[PDB]
Design a protein around this ligand. Structure first.
Ligand SMILES: *[C@@H]1O[C@H](CO)[C@@H](O[C@@H]2O[C@H](CO)[C@@H](O[C@H]3O[C@H](CO)[C@@H](O)[C@H](O)[C@@H]3O)[C@H](O)[C@H]2NC(C)=O)[C@H](O)[C@H]1NC(C)=O
Ligand SMILES: *[C@@H]1O[C@H](CO)[C@@H](O[C@@H]2O[C@H](CO)[C@@H](O)[C@H](O)[C@H]2NC(C)=O)[C@H](O)[C@H]1NC(C)=O
Length: 317
């Protein structure tokens, strides 16, 4: 048996070497070397450090500065919101764990991080279907009279919640379950087992198409009709803001693909001798999601932030 199984835990190590045990009371130091965990903490601290402020500051910049009620800034005020849940929820939760080397918060604790950590990641997918389509309808605009405003920018934002909710709830109330992964410090969806008692395989189909490949093909279908793209004074300033979005389509697919792809490799190889590092690393590499969003948002589009940050502002242009 390449691993070891229980009622509320799967772990990739063989009890052949009579040393495996639950990750809920004792530490899992037979998964890796002690020092490696310390790094996942050091890694984790930075995810809390840089994440919280840059998200919370953009939440505080916008609330005071009422001139950023733009349909551009509306979506990037939705992500800063969803990032803060992954800091105080998803990151803190796991920080604790990495340091000691075991889920102390318990089974219910594993069900808290997952509900949050999947919520934040899928909010950055259902919101990109508004970002990919907001840009599509004003470059390939089929209806001249139409305009993107606030009844479209709040009810396009609430579409992202109401579809991300339908992604994170299922494990809590029927379809599958949240469960510790790799080094047993993060907690995501069950990718490994059948557990027919709670319908795993049937949630995964629904998740791979509807909660991944549907938003991916929709962001190839509208990306594909912007390939063909006059006095370009108004164009040229607004062709680097189109670019900015692509960098958060790129950086997304650098971070979340290693995890996404390896997750499929395991779901095909249902119980091979795949290690702990193998599944963990891409998750935590993918979990920089909440930090890179507003950095490029400041390095490409920026003034308002320094203005609240200032003390005595001065006019620059
Ligand atoms: C494979 O690994 C174990 C041996 O490597 C094997 O033995 C049993 O492991 C459990 C671990 O929970 C022990 O249970 C003890 O756990 C704590 C001690 O802090 C107490 O709360 C419990 O009451 C209990 O004392 C068992 O003692 C141990 N059996 C032996 C060897 O005496 C498990 O069968 C395998 N591990 C898993 C998770 O399936
Ligand atoms: C136990 O670990 C072994 C590693 O040697 C796994 O071996 C694979 O088993 C499949 C059969 O499903 C073979 O056809 C392959 O050649 C092996 N390699 C890989 C990477 O696929 C084996 O899967 C594990 N046993 C299980 C399923 O518990």
């Amino acid at each position: 048996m390449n691993g070891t199984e229980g009622p509320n835990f799967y772990v990739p190590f063989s009890n052949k070497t009579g040393v495996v045990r639950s990750p809920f009371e004792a530490p899992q130091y037979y998964l890796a070397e002690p020092w490696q965990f310390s790094m996942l903490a050091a890694y984790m601290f930075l995810l809390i450090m840089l994440g919280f402020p840059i998200n919370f500051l953009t939440l505080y910049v916008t609330v005071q500065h009422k001139k950023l009620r733009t349909p551009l800034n509306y979506i990037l005020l939705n992500l800063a919101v969803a990032d803060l849940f992954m800091v105080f929820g998803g990151f803190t939760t796991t920080l604790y764990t990495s340091l000691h080397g075991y889920f102390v918060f318990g089974p219910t604790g594993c069900n808290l991080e997952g509900f949050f950590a999947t919520l934040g990641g899928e909010i950055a997918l259902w919101s990109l279907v508004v970002l990919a389509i907001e840009r599509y309808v004003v470059v390939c605009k089929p209806m001249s009279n139409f305009r993107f405003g606030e009844n479209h920018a709040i009810m396009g934002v609430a579409f992202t919640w109401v579809m991300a909710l339908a992604c994170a709830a299922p494990p809590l109330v029927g379809w599958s379950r949240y469960i510790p992964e790799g080094m047993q410090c993060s907690c995501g969806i069950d990718y490994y087992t059948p557990h027919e008692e709670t319908n795993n395989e049937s949630f995964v189909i629904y998740m791979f198409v509807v909660h991944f490949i549907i938003p991916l093909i929709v962001i190839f279908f509208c990306y594909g009709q912007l390939v063909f793209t006059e006095s370009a004074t108004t164009q040229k300033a607004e062709k680097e803001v189109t670019r900015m979005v692509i960098i958060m389509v790129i950086a997304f697919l650098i971070c979340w693909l290693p995890y996404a792809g390896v997750a499929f490799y395991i779901f095909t190889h249902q119980g091979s001798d795949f290690g702990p590092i193998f599944m963990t690393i891409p998750a935590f590499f993918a979990k920089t999601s909440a930090v890179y969003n507003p950095v490029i948002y400041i390095m490409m589009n920026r003034n308002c932030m320094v203005t609240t940050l200032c003390c005595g502002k001065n006019p620059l242009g």
